[PDB]
Paper text:
Glial-cell line derived neurotrophic factor ([name]) bound to its co-receptor [name]α1 stimulates the RET receptor tyrosine kinase, promoting neuronal survival and neuroprotection. The [name]-[name]α1 complex also supports synaptic cell adhesion independently of RET. [name]α family members consist of either two or three extracellular cysteine-rich helical domains (D1-3) followed by a flexible C-tail (CT) and either a glycophosphatidylinositol (GPI)-anchor or a transmembrane domain (GFRAL). Each GFL-[name]α complex has a 2:2 stoichiometry (GFL2-[name]α2) that adopts a U-shaped structure with variable hinge angles.
Here, we describe the structure of a decameric [name]-[name]α1 assembly determined by crystallography and electron microscopy, revealing two [name]α1 pentamers bridged by five [name] dimers. The monoclinic crystals were grown using recombinant zGFRα1 residues 20-353, (defined as zGFRα1D1-D3, lacking the GPI-anchor) in complex with [name] residues 134–235 (mature form of [name], defined hereafter as zGDNFmat). Missing from the structure is the zGFRα1 D1 domain, which we found to be removed by time-dependent proteolytic clipping during crystallisation. Within the decameric assembly, the five ‘U’-shaped GDNF2-[name]α12 sub-complexes associate with one another about the five-fold axis through [name]α1:[name]α1 interactions from the tips of the ‘U’. This arrangement generates two [name]α1 pentamer rings (green in Fig. 1b) that form the base and lid of the barrel, connected by five covalent [name] dimer ‘staves’ (yellow/orange in Fig. 1b). The barrel molecular dimensions are 138 Å in length with a diameter of 118 Å. Unique to the barrel however, is a homophilic [name]α1:[name]α1 interface generated by the non-crystallographic five-fold rotational symmetry. To form this interface, helices α12 and α15 from the D3 domain of one [name]α1 molecule (grey in Fig. 1d) dock into a groove formed by helix α9, helix α14 and helix α16 in the adjacent [name]α1 protomer (green in Fig. 1d). The interface includes L247/V251 from helix α12, L289/L290 from helix α14 and F348 from helix α16, together with several hydrogen bonds and charge interactions at the interface periphery. Electron density can be seen extending from the specific N-glycosylation site of all [name] protomers and a total of 8 N-linked glycans for the 10 zGFRα1 protomers are well resolved within the barrel structure.
Numbering used by the authors:
A (entry chain L), C (entry chain H): 140 to 235
B (entry chain R), D (entry chain N): 141 to 235
E (entry chain G): 150 to 353
F (entry chain K): 150 to 319, 323 to 354
Amino acid sequence: RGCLLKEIHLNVTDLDLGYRTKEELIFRYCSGPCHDAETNYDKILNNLTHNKKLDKDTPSRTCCRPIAFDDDISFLDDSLEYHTLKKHSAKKCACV
Amino acid sequence: GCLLKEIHLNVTDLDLGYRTKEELIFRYCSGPCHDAETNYDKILNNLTHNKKLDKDTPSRTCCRPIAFDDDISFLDDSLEYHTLKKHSAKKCACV
Amino acid sequence: RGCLLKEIHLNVTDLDLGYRTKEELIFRYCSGPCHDAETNYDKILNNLTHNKKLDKDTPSRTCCRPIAFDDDISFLDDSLEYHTLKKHSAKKCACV
Amino acid sequence: GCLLKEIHLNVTDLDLGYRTKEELIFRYCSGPCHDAETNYDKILNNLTHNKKLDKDTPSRTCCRPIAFDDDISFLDDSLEYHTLKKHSAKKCACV
Amino acid sequence: ENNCLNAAKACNLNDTCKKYRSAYISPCTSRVSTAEVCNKRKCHKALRQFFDKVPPKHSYGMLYCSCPLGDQSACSERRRQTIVPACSYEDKERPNCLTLQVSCKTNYICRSRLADFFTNCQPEPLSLSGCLKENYADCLLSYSGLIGTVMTPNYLRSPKISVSPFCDCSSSGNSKEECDRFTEFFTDNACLRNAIQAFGNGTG
Amino acid sequence: ENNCLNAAKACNLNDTCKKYRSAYISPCTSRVSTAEVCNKRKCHKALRQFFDKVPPKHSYGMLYCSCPLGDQSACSERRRQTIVPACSYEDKERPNCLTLQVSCKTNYICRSRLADFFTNCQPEPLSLSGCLKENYADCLLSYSGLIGTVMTPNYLRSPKISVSPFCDCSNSKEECDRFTEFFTDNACLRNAIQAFGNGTGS
Ligand SMILES: *[C@@H]1O[C@H](CO[C@@H]2O[C@@H](C)[C@@H](O)[C@@H](O)[C@@H]2O)[C@@H](O[C@@H]2O[C@H](CO)[C@@H](O)[C@H](O)[C@H]2NC(C)=O)[C@H](O)[C@H]1NC(C)=O
Ligand SMILES: *[C@@H]1O[C@H](CO)[C@@H](O[C@@H]2O[C@H](CO)[C@@H](O)[C@H](O)[C@H]2NC(C)=O)[C@H](O)[C@H]1NC(C)=O
Ligand SMILES: *[C@@H]1O[C@H](CO)[C@@H](O)[C@H](O)[C@H]1NC(C)=O
Ligand SMILES: *[C@@H]1O[C@H](CO)[C@@H](O)[C@H](O)[C@H]1NC(C)=O
Ligand SMILES: *[C@@H]1O[C@H](CO)[C@@H](O)[C@H](O)[C@H]1NC(C)=O
């Protein structure tokens, strides 16, 4: 648990991707604590950073990220042209 | 980008509470995953910039291990055996 | 061949399961003697208990029990609210 | 709850009529089966309290063996062999 | 006491009816989320399966049970709950009947049943029976054929028998006349009313 | 706001309508070559799929959305682009209507969809509804059922509501004028499209 999917209603313009339209969308993202799913690999990384054994590198630990992307969404812009977006929302999450 | 690195260490360099003079080879993932970002990542940055997602702070691409290395065992000063599993990375990838 | 399946016609209220309804049902149970299916294990338990070798453990001998439960039953109570019961009647018996 | 127990006995302590000095280990099932209760059981308890069922006393969940142990053979005083089957429990379960 | 309750008694004492009655009660009553009260799709699929495999003596004997006055009696309410209306009938949104006719006409099975209903339950004021086609049985089946579909009908809380689908004629536009003719064929139809009453008369 | 723009919003917010709307926009908006603007065959197959899977409240709410009757209104333009006419409707050569009927009648599905259209959308000046058959729904479906065939119709730019296939009429010509008039000026079709819009709007 913890790592969980959350939803929001936005204008297409709220994504600030440069489009010019009045359409709307529903955006889903992954957010939550992934402390419960840490491996010995993660603990070692945390102890190496504390003791500065690994001099400079900053390896990453468990991340709450999407493992499945949502269906594609299409919209119509002010100039009567069609645009389609892929991999814009998350369908399923996991501590990975 | 997301590449695997090696680092020779003691078994006590891991600060896991073990008592031994044994040694190990530790492999970790470190690299940029910028060339593998998607619309989902760009949307998150833009929403966190204008602060539409005021409370939360979701994660973008993470250079993480997708397969762990083999197990490692060692003997301590008290002549007791210990085995670790999932302690080093075998292969990395942008997740 | 002695552990048989018997039938009884009852009110739902005759089961005293807390319901208030005028619906009816057919209840089926197992009853019979399992002396024909006893093994060395049973007659050992009978003797050991007589000798009191076993410290009041009183293990159970062969029982005439169901091996297959009947279909579920649903009824409507006096308050116009639906209920359903599972594993209430016996479809097949056997000396277990 | 329904568990398996062991006892060390003589073939004579079973009072099956045998005359021998051989020994054995007898395993049986004993424990409670309240966790494996079904409505069918409860209905039987409520009907026996009342007198709906006529002198039937049906049986509720029993703690019984679901698998018997290997056979056992012994030699009696008269230099004769006997073999017993389905005499000890190998696996128990609420039935 | 109540012909409608005697129909249930006969059903639970019939192995085939008992099995399939519970088959549709459980899905239409088992919640799946704080928002959803049931899996409406699986609920309708069990209803249709109930009227297909349960013999008609028992299945329809419960749906058309004879009640003195189907308004606010125990007999009337037991009959209203036969299809579990909280799951199969009602809904969060009440559609316009034009949109509901379009939705039914896309699906082949719904279209055929709706066409058979308006053909076989046509009323005729000059007929002693009330039905133009002069066959109660053909009208009952056609109506029952709409239960599990998007056009699920159920008894309304009225003095006399009144059934309807879950649709309304809110539009004040000129289409209100064609919408009224659709609902009136369900609500006030002397052929369907005589058939339902006629069947309960027989299984009483 | 436009009833058409609100319908598109309601589609994107419905997972089923969003998925299948994107399913037909992509092929009709993906260029296969410099000469060919799209895989018209795959564009038509995705349109038909959109009207079969999406519930009618959304699918037909966008197609038959209510406009203010303003000439070249934003709603009307949005509604006109509903089918991606640049790929499904338009074509290099405008055929004669006699030849287009022969093509539609060779394909069993188009033939039936056309027969169902004429039968169910017959006008009647005497009828208050305008339809001889007196069922708007049966006329709306028969029309939409043509949206994925060679006889694909789409709105024309007029002050009124006019729909036409991609055909033109030029020995005998009156029979061809009757065919085009059945789409362009049919009081049964016009009244139905303005009935659904009244119901699925506010
Ligand atoms: C099903 O229930 C009926 C009704 O229960 C009776 O009335 C209750 C108020 C209570 O007093 C119960 O103890 C009663 O049994 C049963 O039918 C009645 O049975 C009694 C006992 O013989 C008899 O005197 C009544 O005339 C019966 N009919 C009535 C009360 O209307 C019936 O036995 C139960 N079992 C079935 C139907 O299988
Ligand atoms: C088999 O029987 C013998 C008796 O013949 C049991 O041995 C006796 O055990 C008790 C309790 O320790 C002693 O007080 C006796 O002196 C024993 N008798 C002899 C002759 O040694 C023996 O315990 C039995 N076998 C098992 C497994 O219990
Ligand atoms: C959508 O756009 C309107 C107009 O800019 C804005 O007020 C609104 O907050 C946006 N988001 C939602 C969910 O309506
Ligand atoms: C291992 O331990 C020794 C001291 O016992 C230390 O000098 C050495 O640096 C350690 N290994 C590494 C890789 O540093
Ligand atoms: C739709 O509503 C308008 C406005 O009331 C009305 O003039 C028109 O006749 C209606 N069309 C229908 C119901 O088909």
